[PDB]
Amino acid sequence: ELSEAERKAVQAMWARLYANSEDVGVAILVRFFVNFPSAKQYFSQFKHMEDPLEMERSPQLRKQASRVMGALNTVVENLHDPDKVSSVLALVGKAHALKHKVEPVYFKILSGVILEVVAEEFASDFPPETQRAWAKLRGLIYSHVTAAYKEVGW
Amino acid sequence: ELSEAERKAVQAMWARLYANSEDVGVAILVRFFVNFPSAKQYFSQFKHMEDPLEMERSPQLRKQASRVMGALNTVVENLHDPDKVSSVLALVGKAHALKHKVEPVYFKILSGVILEVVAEEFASDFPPETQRAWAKLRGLIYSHVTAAYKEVGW
Ligand code: HEM
Ligand code: HEM
Ligand SMILES: [C-]#N
Ligand SMILES: [C-]#N
């Protein structure tokens, strides 16, 4: 869990990010699929795409970006309610294990990608205090998602 | 395995990286450790470094960077001799499996990082025919390292 200052520093960041949630989610997923093509495999929509400029344009990927961003949104907006953050990531985890059958490690890879993009987008307003704050939310998603994978028996 | 055209493409690309192997290896390791803090954990000598400027400047992180580029150069310089590269990568696999006790997925994460660092530094000499070529070398490396981990029973 986080403080009130770390929570506020993360939400202020996410405030800007989510202003153009579509164009940010897309930069994230395109980099995820370019730098880790093994991640595409899980996606019947994208598994046959190699051109990154083709991914930027594709409507289904934009539909997928929104979907991730929006779920992340519910987490960031509820960091004050640890019963809410728990319950949301429980659901994301379980569904990714049971329906999507995704190897839990990719959540770690995706996280790092989210850091790289955020670090480029917001270089001039990403001080040490905010980096650590963001590292704390990363660890939070990861250990809640992995407990769901454990709970379901992976 | 790569064709004669794909081999030369990788080599012409690698000749540019390796012209300043220290600087490039350092750039790679630093991003690796920042976006994947859990990779740091493995290194007794770096697990407590947090400031990226502090890393660039440390002689020991420089030395480790020259060790990676050093080994990679031997793979790349020998891409005509597949028994040769098969041997080097298996040696690298078994060492990291048995002596360093590094989990094998970290090799995929590092390559991903190598691709993003190369894209940033050498955009001008990284056209789609080379992107495509480099991606095959990556798949070679990984499956020869996966095989090394399996041969040893991980
Ligand atoms: C921050 C972490 C993540 C969040 C919040 C997230 C969110 C979502 C949401 C909300 C959906 C749609 C609802 C559903 O069917 O479950 C979805 C679908 C999906 N997710 Fe994720 N996701 C995350 C990470 C990942 C990762 C790392 C992968 C593996 C590459 C992945 C693979 C998939 C797949 C294959 C689908 C189905 C897409 C389809 O309908 O074809 N997710 N995700
Ligand atoms: C194919 C890419 C890689 C190459 C060419 C490479 C090369 C090397 C070399 C030459 C050494 C020193 C000699 C030795 O003991 O083998 C070394 C040490 C080491 N490597 Fe790697 N490595 C690679 C990937 C990785 C990855 C992905 C990790 C994950 C964290 C890793 C972790 C380590 C550790 C913990 C050591 C020992 C550190 C020490 O000297 O105290 N390596 N590597
Ligand atoms: C991922 N969606
Ligand atoms: C790895 N050094």
Author numbering:
A (entry chain A), B (entry chain B): 18 to 171
Reproduce, without paraphrasing, sentences from the article in which this PDB structure was first reported.
Almost independently, the sequence of this globin was identified in mouse, man and zebrafish and, given that it is expressed in all types of human tissues, was eventually termed cytoglobin (Cygb). Human Cygb consists of 190 amino acids, showing extensions of about 20 amino acids at both C- and N-termini with respect to standard globins. In the absence of exogenous ligands, the sixth heme iron coordination position is occupied by the distal HisE7 residue in both the ferric and ferrous forms.
Since the HE7Q mutation disrupts the endogenous bis-histidyl hexacoordination with HisE7, the comparison of wt Cygb* and its HE7Q mutant provides clues on the transition from exogenous hexacoordination to the endogenous one through the pentacoordinated species. The two subunits (A, B) found in the X-ray structure are assembled in a dimer identical to that found for native Cygb*. Superimposition of the Cα atoms in the protein core of the two subunits reveals a strong structural conservation (rmsd of 0.45 Å), with limited differences in the G-H loop (residues 137–146). The cyanide ligand in the distal site pocket is found almost parallel to the heme plane (distance of 3.22 and 2.87 Å found in subunits A and B of the X-ray structure), oriented roughly along the line connecting the pyrrole NA and NC nitrogen atoms. This arrangement indicates that the structure better fits a pentacoordinated protein. The absence of ligand coordination likely arises from X-ray-induced Fe(III)→Fe(II) reduction, resulting essentially in loss of heme affinity for the ligand, as has been noticed for other heme proteins. Structural overlays of the HE7Q mutant with bis-histidyl hexa- (subunit A) and pentacoordinated (subunit B) Cygb* yield a rmsd of 0.66 Å and 0.51 Å, respectively. The largest deviations are found at residues 60–66 and 70–83 (CD-D stretch and beginning of helix E), as the shift from endogenous bis-histidyl hexacoordination to pentacoordination drives the E-helix 1.5 Å away from the distal site pocket (measured on the Cα atom of the E7 residue), increasing the distal site volume by about 73 Å3. In the HE7Q mutant the Gln side-chain matches the position of His in the pentacoordinated structure, as the side chain amide N atom is shifted only ∼1 Å relative to the His Nε atom. However, the Gln side chain is pointing to the exterior of the distal site, while the His side chain is oriented to the interior, thus suggesting that the pentacoordinated native Cygb* highlights an intermediate position of HisE7 in the mechanism controlling exogenous ligand binding through competition with the endogenous ligand.
